[PDB]
């Protein structure tokens, strides 16, 4: 839900800038055990309501893996890198799924974010990071879930530059 990000240090907000038109995103997530999860999403503004429409295709998840065995323990917090490619915004991230026995299963997210506004009408952000944290509670088995996420967009303040870069 890319509209809900705290942007610091004056980084342009590609997603909020896109309204009222909205934006789309497309992603393939590659899992280290051979699974793939591909998604396309449309984000629109219907007056005072945001409308998300998502299409999902997932495949090759091992039958004995934590995904198909339904033994996943949620995601670790993650960092995404974002930068312009071909006049749109690209995103790249690694995530880690918590597994039984204190193990992790990693994956890579390959994302392109596409504004429905033309590039000429937008202020494109420079290379930056988005910190994310996703938390899930299963209310009813395989039926009802609740999900929380916090997200911040920033430069690298933690490790400072000598060359005066961001």
């Amino acid at each position: 839900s890319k509209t809900f990000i705290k942007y610091v240090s004056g980084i342009p907000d590609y997603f909020k800038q896109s309204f009222p038109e909205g934006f789309t995103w497309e992603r393939t997530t590659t899992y280290e055990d051979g699974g793939f999860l591909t998604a396309h999403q449309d984000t629109s503004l219907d007056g005072d309501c945001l409308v998300y429409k998502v299409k999902i295709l997932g495949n090759n998840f091992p039958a004995d893996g934590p995904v198909m065995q339904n033994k996943a323990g949620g995601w670790e917090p993650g960092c995404e890198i974002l930068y312009e490619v071909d006049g749109v915004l690209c995103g790249q991230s690694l995530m880690a799924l918590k597994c039984p026995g204190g193990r992790h299963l990693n994956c890579r997210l390959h994302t392109t974010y596409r504004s429905k506004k033309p590039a000429s009408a937008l202020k494109m952000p420079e290379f930056h990071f988005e910190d994310h944290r996703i938390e899930v509670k299963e209310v009813q088995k395989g039926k009802h879930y609740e999900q929380y996420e916090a997200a911040v967009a920033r430069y690298c303040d933690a490790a400072p530059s000598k060359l005066g870069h961001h």
């Binding site: 509209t3 997530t29 309501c49 999902i56 997932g58 198909m68 339904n70 899930v136 999900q147 997200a151």
Partner: protein, 58 residues
């Protein structure tokens, strides 16, 4: 956009040959970068896979 913003979601897909549909409703603070939502599996439930793989799409 307003300081507290609601959203709704429709989701459809196939994972390892299993077809499913989901709906969602939520709210968040666009400028603080926080949000919460409910997700219901309306078709193909109970999900025969870890819901976690759908988290980044929701």
């Amino acid at each position: 956009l307003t300081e507290t913003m609601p959203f709704r979601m429709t989701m459809e897909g196939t994972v390892n040959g299993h077809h499913f549909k989901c709906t969602g409703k939520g709210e968040g603070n666009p400028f603080e970068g926080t949000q919460d939502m409910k997700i219901e599996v309306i078709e193909g439930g109970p999900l025969p896979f870890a819901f976690d793989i759908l988290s980044t799409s929701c």
